[model samples]
Target: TFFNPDREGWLLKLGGRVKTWKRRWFILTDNCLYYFEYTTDKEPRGIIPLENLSIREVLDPRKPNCFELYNPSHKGQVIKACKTEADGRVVEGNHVVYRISAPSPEEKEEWMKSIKASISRDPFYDM
Candidate 1:
């Protein structure tokens, strides 16, 4: 894979349903956002598509520099769990919303802007 990621960084993400915070390596691309348990991992833990998604800064009671990714249509789940190459158990449950906390306030704003730009890239405008 010679492709380069649009943006990549580490962030603390809240688990779906379980509601626990875990630091993961996040990669952003034109198509989606992917997270890995480790930066060296070949496969990502989950993929969150950019289409029809919106982002907004959120205030977390216990955390700072937090923002959320969500779908405006309230349709099907937005998250897709990936199978681990090591045969680890598949991550359970899909999420419609994702809460991410960046390392700092500036980083959080950077992520939000990058994500918005990615999501705003409509092919129709290329005409």
Candidate 2:
């Protein structure tokens, strides 16, 4: 392929899923998981909550050049955190496991760095 300036972080841009190996784009934010079509797509095709963002691997020998996001949370589980007495508190649970891959090792590293940073910003992030 070619260098995609529009690509940001490690979002599995034009990547595939473990199931059926279909097309997918998985985006991560400071709070939630968002998906898009093509790196240039301005909007998300869908979104998933970040609860069990507890699983991650970088081109593991078991997977190979694949960046995976696992929620492991209960299905249909959603939590809305609000301001706390001082700051706020979040009540989250397991998340659905999501597996996606990047076109190259460099992009995969970028996405992983972005997501790792995003989750750290969450005050209620599960350790």
lDDT of 1 by residue, 81-123 (tens): 4434356776544777889999998899889988888777856
CA deviation > 4 Å runs, candidate 2: 1-18, 38-43, 58-64, 71-96
Model 2 TM-score is 0.54
Using lDDT as the measure, the top candidate is 1
Model 1's lDDT to the true fold? Answer: 0.78
Worst 10 residues of 2 by lDDT: 78-87
Name the lDDT of candidate 2: 0.50
Off by over 4 Å in 1: 75-93, 124-127
TM-score of 1: 0.82
lDDT (C-alpha, whole model) for all candidates? 0.78, 0.50
Among the numbered candidates, top TM-score falls to 1
Q: Assess every candidate by TM-score.
A: 0.82, 0.54
What would the per-residue lDDT of candidate 2 be over residues 20-112, giving only the tens digit for each residue?
443456545545655555667655455555554644764444444676565445554333222112234432323234566666777767766
Q: What is the lDDT of residue 75 in candidate 2?
A: 54
Worst 10 residues of 1 by lDDT: 77-86
